[PDB]
């Protein structure tokens, strides 16, 4: 389909698989999102990463 | 060559010279839980020989008027030998079973016993007789232990279902003129890979006389029915202190 | 590492369940082959030993002289989906104006299809079942009249707040799935997935849900398996003011993508309660008809 | 169709032929099931199978 | 379409051209039938056929 | 012609009388062969079933 690229997720790090019948992409369905995760951004945002075996403070 | 048999497992051996082959429930042998069906992460314990052995738990007397009995698994073994201890110390349990029901007589006695295994054998009450009272069976009736329990209304298996169709379950018959035992091998049957040996009884063993015991005055009148069983592929997980219920 | 022999040669850990039988395609009834007279010793198809626990292996061919019959009768209509994928009644919900039940314009129904005999008896032929389902909701007044009324059905899974009134905050339905429809519109219809924590639903559970002493006052929990409790189905008329019409909602279920395990005897005594197999002890009836003598029709 | 594999029969020993218009497979029709049968599992679950001609107990 | 062959005319000496949207063929339209005819089966079922020119009884 | 299977495979009409025995020449009384003691299990010529 040759429509407009006016979706809120146009240019996202996760590609979607949607359905639409109109010339404006935001009219499309939610579809399926990409199953990528990055827990470290929140759970482990340390500069110098420390291993599991070693002692965190040495 | 199909009439004679020897069942050896653990430090126990059984013999019979009047068998009728062996039944393997739903056509499949017991097995350990695969890594893809499993869900609990702790490494299981598989005691082997100390728990996968033959245990002779009870003897009932077959009388001309007997109505029939039933036992629940693994309830019957929860307080016996090493198997019992493992079932008590662990939250999770799973296993198969080899059931061997024994009953011999003479070439002049007659009668036939239906020996069957019924998974998820839920017991019902007579609802106060009129059916207007929603009563429920007591713990000693749902989980009778090693002594088992006698059926009150065998025709409907004490659960509103026809015993005449019980043969749709893994079974064998002990027809005195033919054989003196029944051997049924049962795999683990459940909708979960493991479960509690205490709160859940996977199946029930039913031993019901369909053709009444009979003989003439003078012949041995005491005709016992003995229940021997052995766990197969026992696995346990979720360790902590022992609990009886 | 392993070094003692008994350990190296043990079968401990075998996860491959050996199977003695396997499925073969059977799209039509078996055919009949030609057969002739047989007058042999040693060969005896007619004699069996039912004690073994197996059904007779004797066939027409070996009991009488047969002809050849090419049987093209299909076996399609006896598949699990063919048998179950037919919508049946499993629930009724009344929303009367003046009543003793749900006179407040809303109702909560615990999802439990064991309240109706036809559907119940069919599913109880098996112990374990896994399936998706199509649910259809038929609404109208008690006379079957269609009135211009708007309703709201909401699926409240275990742990979600159950609406306690027609204006309850839970009707905001920001996460639970809700259907808004008119009695004038065709019956609402949706697809439901297999939602149990278990690999299958089970119509029978010979156990207790919790640990501890199972004294008289708790025996009502024997046979209760939470793995089968999918939640509540709530309905309400949409408005802060009472509806002008009395309503009834009939719930139909159509299973699909069905799998079943462990067949069992079929109920032969009338049902009394949803939660159990209790039967009227003073009315135990034969499974079927009877006659005066075994030598007379 | 590139949908989700959330049907109750996903990974069954019998393949189905269904129709669907949504991203969730369980929304699909019942279709046609595979006509395979295994009567022996119930009718003849014996360890040592015995022929028809011979005598079951010998 | 991969449907069931449950039509009343499945295996007929005349092929049809039909439309259907369901898995059961009998749900299909009537379509067009084959224009074959065999009048003789009724109009001239004689063992020894006689020509037009000759006299039927000779 | 024949087309249904039971007809094609029938033995109806077999005029050949099958014989279980056949004649052998015997111009003289049978001879006697040497024999020795036999002390076996399983073998039992003396026992019959008239
Ligand atoms: C707008 C929102 O629209 N939402 C619709 C909607 C409809 C239906 C939904 O759920 C369907 C779940 C059904 C199929 C499970 C029925 N089962 C399985 C096991 N079991 C059971 C077993 C043993 N015993 C009992 C007993 N009662 O004693 C009971 C059952 O009753 C959910 C949502």
Protein architecture, described:
The structure is cut from a larger assembly and holds three copies of chain A (58 residues), one copy of chain B (245 residues) and two copies of chain C. Chain A is largely without helices or strands and 58 residues long. The longest helix of chain B has 9 residues. Helix content of chain B is 5%, strand content 37%. Chain B contains two helices and twelve strands. By secondary structure, chain C is mainly β. Chain C has one domain: Jelly Rolls, CATH 2.60.120. Chain C has four helices and ten strands; from the N terminus they run αβααββαβββββββ. In chain C, strands 2, 4, 7, 8 and 10 form a five-stranded antiparallel β-sheet that branches. In chain C, strands 3-9-5-6 form a four-stranded antiparallel β-sheet, with no helix packed on it. Chain C is extended, with a radius of gyration of 27 Å. In chain C, 24% of the residues are buried. The chains are: A little secondary structure (58), B mainly beta (245), C mainly beta (297). Chains in contact: A-D, B-C, B-D, C-D, C-F, D-E. Chains B and C meet through strand 3 and strand 9 of B and strand 8 of C. The complex binds the ligand CCO/N=C/c1ccc(OCC[C@@H](C)CCN2CCN(c3ccnc(C(N)=O)c3)C2=O)cc1. The ligand CCO/N=C/c1ccc(OCC[C@@H](C)CCN2CCN(c3ccnc(C(N)=O)c3)C2=O)cc1 binds next to strand 4, strand 5, strand 6 and strand 7 of chain C. Chains A, D, E: It is found in: Host cytoplasmic vesicle membrane; Host nucleus; Virion. Chains A, D, E: Capsid protein VP0: Component of immature procapsids, which is cleaved into capsid proteins VP4 and VP2 after maturation. Allows the capsid to remain inactive before the maturation step.
Biggest sheet overview of chain A = none
What would the principal axes of the Cα set say about the shape of chain B?
A: globular
Fraction of helical residues of chain A? under 10%
**Number of extended strands of chain B:** 12
Radius of gyration of chain B: 19 Å
* Helix percent band of chain B: under 10%
Q: What is the string of helix and strand elements of chain A?
A: H
> How do the strands line up in the largest sheet of chain B?
3-10-6-12-4
Structural class of chain A: little secondary structure
CATH class of chain B: Mainly Beta
How many structural domains in the coordinates of chain B? 1
Q: How far is the N terminus from the C terminus of chain A?
A: 59 Å
Give me the CATH fold name of chain A. Rhinovirus 14, subunit 4
Structural class of chain B: mainly beta
Number of domains of chain A: 1
Q: CA-to-CA gap between the ends of chain B?
A: 45 Å
Measured by DSSP, the beta-strand proportion of chain B falls in 35-45%
- CATH fold-level topology of chain B: Jelly Rolls
Which CATH architecture of chain B would you pick?
Answer: Sandwich
**Biggest interface, chains and residue tallies:** B-C, 78 and 64 residues
Second-tier CATH architecture of chain A: Irregular
PDB class: virus
Keywords: virus, hand-foot-and-mouth disease, enterovirus uncoating, inhibitor
Entry title: Crystal structure of human Enterovirus 71 in complex with the uncoating inhibitor ALD
Chains A, D, E: VP4
């Amino acid at each position: 389909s040759h429509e407009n690229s006016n979706s809120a997720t146009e240019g996202s790090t996760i590609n979607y698989t949607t359905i639409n019948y109109y010339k404006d992409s935001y009219a499309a369905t939610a579809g399926k999102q990409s199953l990528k995760q990055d827990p470290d951004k929140f759970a482990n945002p340390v500069k110098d990463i420390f291993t599991e075996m070693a002692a965190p403070l040495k | 060559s199909d009439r004679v048999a020897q069942l050896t497992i653990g430090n126990s051996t059984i013999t019979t010279q009047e068998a009728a082959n062996i039944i393997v429930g739903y056509g499949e042998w017991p097995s350990y839980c695969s890594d893809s069906d499993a869900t609990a992460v702790d490494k299981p314990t598989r005691p082997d020989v100390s728990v996968n052995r033959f245990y002779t738990l009870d003897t009932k007397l077959w009388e001309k008027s007997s109505k029939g009995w039933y036992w629940k698994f693994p309830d019957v073994l929860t307080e016996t030998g090493v198997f019992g201890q493992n079932a008590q110390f662990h939250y999770l349990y799973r296993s198969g079973f080899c059931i061997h029901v024994q009953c011999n007589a003479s070439k002049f006695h007659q009668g036939a016993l239906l020996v069957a295994v019924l998974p998820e054998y839920v017991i019902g009450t007579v609802a106060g007789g009129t059916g207007t009272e929603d009563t429920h069976p007591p713990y000693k009736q749902t989980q009778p232990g090693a002594d088992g329990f006698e059926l009150q209304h065998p025709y409907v298996l004490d659960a509103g279902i026809p015993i005449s169709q019980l043969t749709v379950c893994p079974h064998q018959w002990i027809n005195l003129r033919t054989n003196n035992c029944a051997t049924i091998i049962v795999p683990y049957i459940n909708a979960l890979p493991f479960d509690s040996a205490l709160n859940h009884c996977n199946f029930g063993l039913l031993v019901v006389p369909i053709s009444p015991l009979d003989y003439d005055q003078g012949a041995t009148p005491v005709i016992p029915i003995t229940i021997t069983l052995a766990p197969m592929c026992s696995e346990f997980a979720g360790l902590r202190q022992a609990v009886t219920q | 590492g392993d070094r003692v022999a008994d350990v190296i040669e043990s079968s401990i850990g075998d996860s491959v369940s050996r199977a003695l039988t396997h499925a073969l395609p059977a799209p039509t009834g078996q055919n009949t082959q030609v057969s002739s007279h047989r007058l042999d010793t040693g060969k005896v198809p007619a004699l069996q030993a039912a004690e073994i626990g197996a059904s007779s292996n004797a066939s027409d061919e070996s009991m009488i002289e047969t002809r050849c019959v090419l049987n093209s009768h299909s076996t399609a209509e006896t598949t699990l989906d063919s048998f179950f994928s037919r919508a049946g009644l499993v629930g009724e919900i009344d929303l009367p104006l003046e009543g003793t039940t749900n006179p407040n314009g809303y109702a909560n129904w615990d999802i439990d299809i064991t309240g109706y005999a036809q559907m119940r008896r069919k599913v109880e032929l098996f112990t374990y079942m896994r399936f998706d389902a199509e649910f259809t909701f038929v609404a109208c007044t008690p006379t079957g009249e269609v009135v211009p009324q708007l309703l709201q059905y909401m699926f409240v899974p275990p742990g979600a707040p159950k609406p306690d009134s027609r204006e309850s905050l839970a009707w905001q339905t920001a996460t639970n799935p809700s259907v808004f429809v008119k009695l004038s519109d065709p019956p609402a219809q949706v697809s439901v997935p297999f939602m149990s924590p278990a690999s299958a639903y089970q119509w029978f559970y010979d156990g207790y849900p919790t640990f501890g002493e199972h004294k008289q006052e708790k025996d009502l929990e024997y046979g209760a398996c939470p793995n089968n409790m999918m939640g509540t189905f709530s309905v309400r008329t949409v408005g802060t003011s009472k509806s002008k019409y009395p309503l009834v909602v009939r719930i139909y279920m159509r299973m699909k993508h069905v799998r079943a395990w462990i067949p069992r005897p079929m109920r032969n005594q009338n049902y009394l309660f949803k939660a159990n197999p209790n039967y009227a002890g003073n009315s135990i009836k034969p499974t079927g008809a009877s006659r005066t003598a075994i030598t007379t029709l």
